[PDB]
Structures are given as structure tokens and as C-alpha cells.
């Protein structure tokens, strides 16, 4: 069916451009207007302005004006948008959208701070039906996501937001699940940090 | 540019009982053309939006049929006949009739239900952090009801409120709960000092805390 790949993340430093993509498939690209949103973490929507891919006539909020540019290539079905001389007030989620169908976005971190992969450390039991957990600390920017047994447990799952302490994030993730199956059965924590496009697993072994 | 104002900003409502989300535009929102191009969206925390309602009343297919919207000129509804856990998250109203599009602030959708009791889990540092001179004790308050909560530390039965993190969920997508994450950092050498570690919660549940522990 339909869908719009964007990148997870992007970290840049101020003053910089960068160009993010949206990748689309599963209908033919030129028959429908590719709009671009911005959000900002914890805020509300932002309406960028959109490009018809058949001829590139292209709208622009004019809160946008030449921070942001518009452009296609039809040869790849993808949709770019081009911001120039970035700044903190540019930090934030960008969705690339079509009728009735959204992207997953793409967190843009604009900061000249270095990628800082994660440490992941898991959360046993020091001893029915048990608890077990994933700590992901000390991890710059924005975001992580978190799986368990690569999608296959889902739930009884609690993934939670993450706080910011010295300039580093951390999260946690905890899934409940039946005594019967652990440690009996393999549990493992998946960690993915596209920024540094770093992965990480964790088998959940007994303490 | 034309603006969009929801109301409320929270709508907080009993299971089976039918929900209300007004919105309102600065300026009427009929085209030139005769369409009246207000639309409804739905983000779920963590997700991308999800478009519901199109042309005010047209509803996506792949939406449950207790959804409906109705209004016209700047004045404008979405019904639930019924909510659902499901239907947990931010109500967005957008408009495409004048350029720029605009879209409302949101309206948070919540969901009434009985009283739960957190279940409490504690765990210590991780073998492998340790080693790398840092430590962090954790704490999970998962599944409770109500929101209203809160969490003390305990080192050797004395407080502890520095190097404390906190994290909360939104209402759970199946049961309507809340859960929530402490976590306290410490370095190895204050770590290693002392014996006994006591994460405790504060919920209506309970007449006293909530309290569990362990010690090395």
C-alpha cells in the first residue's frame, strides 16, 4: 500500500543547510500534491507549503520564505525540502505529507554538538509474571526507538519519554511477561539511534 | 492568515459516552468553489498524524464508523459516538480553504475509568555500568489510575531528591492507564556506600505508600 520513507534523524550544526528527503511509493507520484509540516517537540503543526511533482509548482507559507525550498525528482519518486543557515528555532520534526497519508518525519537536531550514541543496560530481576526493563542512557539527539524481540513483543510494553540531563538524553522501556516464558525463553531489548545510525541489543539475562 | 481555535483543550470523558470536539475559524472556511475544505487528524503520542475527516463530514475509510463530523461557515464538530482506549491521543482540526493551511492547537482526548493501583518494580545498576563508574536505580509505577501521582526515593531510609528523573506515559492504548518511570543516578563510589535502596509511591489507591526495595 501507500507510504512516504522519510529519514529518522539529522543532527547539523548552526549556520549549515541541509536537505531532507521523503521517499514515495505504492502510487504514482506526480498525481498528488506533496505537502511539507513542521512540528516542534511538544508544540503544534506548521503548515511549510507543498509542490505539485507533475510540473513543480510550488506554495510557500511565507513564514518559510527562503529558509525553505521545494523540489523533486521524478526519476526516484522523492520529494526534498532545502533549509538554509539553520538555527535552534529550526529543530524539529518534519513531515512530509499527500492526501489522507502522512510520514513518518524526521527529527532535525540543529546543534554543534557531537553524535553520542547510546549505552544500553538491562533491568533483571534480583528475586508468576515479571518485569523486565531497558535502560538507554547518555544518547544526543533525538530520537531512539525501542523493540522488543524485534517487534514480536508488544504488549504489556511501556516506553517512555525521554528526559535531558547535561545535555545527554535518557529513556527507559519496560515489558511485562509471563514467568512461564522467561528466562525460560529469550527476551532481548532492540535499541536504534538513526542519528548515528547505531543498533543495539540487549539480551535480558537473569541476575 | 486565518486561525483555528479548538475547544476544549482537554476533553475528559466515561467509556460508552459520546464525545464532543469544537472548532472554530476566524473566517469562514467556504470556498470559491463551493467546498468547504475542513479536515480532522489524530496523532497518537509517539505516532505520525492520521487523517480522519475530510470536507467536514467525509470520513477516511480505515476509521472506525463512530466517528462523524458535521458544521459549516467557521463553525465546526467531531462526534464519537462511543470512545474507545484506542481513541486516545491529540485532535487536530485543519484548514485548507485559505493559504496558508492552518490547524488548531489540539484537543487531548481522555478517558474515564476505575481506580487502579500501581504495580511497583526496582531495579539496581546494571552489572555492565558499573564498570563504566556510573549507577542508576530504577523505578517503574505501570498501569495505575489516576494520573495523580508521585514518587520518594530512599537511601539507608533517608530521602533523597538530587539525581532524580522522572518520565510519564499517557493513557494506555488498550486499558486507559497511566505508568511512569524514576530513575535514580548516582555515581559507583556514593553507590557502593550504602545498603538499602526504597522507591515508594503516593496514589489514592492506598492509605499508605506504595513501597519496594532491595539492598546488596
Known amino acids: 500500500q501507500v507510504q512516504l520513507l522519510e529519514s529518522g534523524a539529522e543532527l547539523v550544526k548552526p549556520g549549515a543547510p541541509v536537505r531532507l528527503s521523503c521517499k514515495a511509493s505504492?502510487?504514482?507520484?506526480?498525481?498528488?500534491?506533496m505537502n511539507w509540516v513542521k512540528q516542534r517537540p511538544g508544540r503544534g503543526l506548521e503548515w511549510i507549503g507543498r509542490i505539485d511533482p507533475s510540473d513543480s509548482e510550488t506554495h510557500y507559507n511565507q513564514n518559510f520564505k527562503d529558509k525553505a525550498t521545494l523540489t523533486v525528482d521524478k526519476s526516484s519518486s522523492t520529494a526534498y525540502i532545502q533549509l538554509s543557515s539553520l538555527t535552534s528555532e529550526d529543530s524539529a520534526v518534519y513531515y512530509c505529507?499527500?492526501?489522507?497519508?502522512w510520514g513518518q518525519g524526521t527529527t532535525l537536531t540543529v546543534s554543534s554538538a557531537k553524535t553520542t550514541p547510546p549505552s544500553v543496560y538491562p533491568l533483571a530481576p534480583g528475586s508468576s509474571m515479571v518485569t523486565l526493563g531497558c535502560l538507554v542512557k547518555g544518547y544526543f539527539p533525538e530520537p531512539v526507538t525501542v523493540t522488543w524481540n524485534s517487534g514480536s513483543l508488544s504488549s504489556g510494553v511501556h516506553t517512555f519519554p525521554a528526559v535531558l540531563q547535561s545535555d545527554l538524553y535518557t529513556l527507559s522501556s519496560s515489558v511485562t511477561v509471563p514467568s512461564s516464558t522467561w528466562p525460560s525463553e529469550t527476551v532481548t531489548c532492540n535499541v536504534a539511534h538513526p542519528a548515528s545510525s547505531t543498533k543495539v541489543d540487549k539480551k535480558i539475562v537473569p541476575r | 492568515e486565518l486561525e483555528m481555535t479548538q475547544s476544549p483543550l482537554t476533553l475528559s470523558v466515561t467509556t460508552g459516552q459520546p464525545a464532543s470536539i469544537s472548532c472554530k475559524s476566524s473566517?469562514?472556511?467556504?470556498?470559491?468553489?463551493?467546498?468547504?475544505?475542513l479536515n480532522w487528524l489524530l496523532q497518537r503520542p509517539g505516532q505520525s498524524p492520521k487523517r480522519l475527516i475530510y470536507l467536514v463530514s467525509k470520513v477516511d475509510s480505515g476509521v472506525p464508523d463512530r466517528f462523524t463530523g458535521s458544521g459549516s461557515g467557521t463553525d465546526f464538530t467531531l462526534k464519537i459516538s462511543r470512545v474507545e482506549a484506542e481513541d486516545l491521543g491529540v485532535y487536530y482540526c485543519?484548514?485548507?480553504?485559505?493559504?496558508?493551511?492552518?490547524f488548531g492547537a489540539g484537543t487531548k482526548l481522555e478517558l474515564k475509568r476505575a481506580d487502579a493501583a500501581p504495580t511497583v518494580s526496582i531495579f539496581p545498576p546494571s552489572s555492565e555500568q558499573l564498570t563504566s563508574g556510573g549507577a542508576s536505580v530504577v523505578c517503574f509505577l505501570n498501569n495505575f489510575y489516576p494520573k495523580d501521582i508521585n514518587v520518594k526515593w530512599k537511601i539507608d531510609g533517608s530521602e533523597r531528591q538530587n539525581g532524580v528523573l522522572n518520565s510519564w506515559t499517557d493513557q494506555d492504548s488498550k486499558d486507559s492507564t497511566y505508568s511512569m518511570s524514576s530513575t535514580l543516578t548516582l555515581t559507583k563510589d556514593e553507590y557502593e556506600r550504602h545498603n538499602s535502596y526504597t522507591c515508594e509511591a503516593t496514589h489514592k489507591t492506598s492509605t499508605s505508600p506504595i513501597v519496594k526495595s532491595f539492598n546488596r
Open positions: 473566517q469562514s472556511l467556504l470556498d470559491s468553489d463551493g467546498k468547504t475544505y
Open positions: 505504492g502510487y504514482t507520484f506526480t498525481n498528488y500534491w
Open positions: 485543519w484548514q485548507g480553504t485559505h493559504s496558508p493551511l492552518t
Open positions: 505529507a499527500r492526501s489522507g497519508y
